[PDB]
Ligand binder design. Sequence first.
Ligand code: CA
Ligand code: CA
Length: 79
Amino acid sequence: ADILSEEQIVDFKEAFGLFDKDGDGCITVEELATVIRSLDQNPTEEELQDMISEVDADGNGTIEFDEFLSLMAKKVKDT
Ligand SMILES: [Ca+2]
Ligand SMILES: [Ca+2]
């Protein structure tokens, strides 16, 4: 069920990969801004930092799959 069948991961991984238009494996604040910008929203660095920091467990200025998945699942943990 939740083994070889990667449905949830694909969705998250698909959203993450799409965000990483560069495919470098990580989305930088500038790159994230581009994604958020498209979503009809564009917060200031501050909000981006506070939002990124809120999840950036390591605080590197970038978002990884685990971090991205947590941020999404963290805001949609309801499911
Ligand atoms: Ca990137
Ligand atoms: Ca990070």
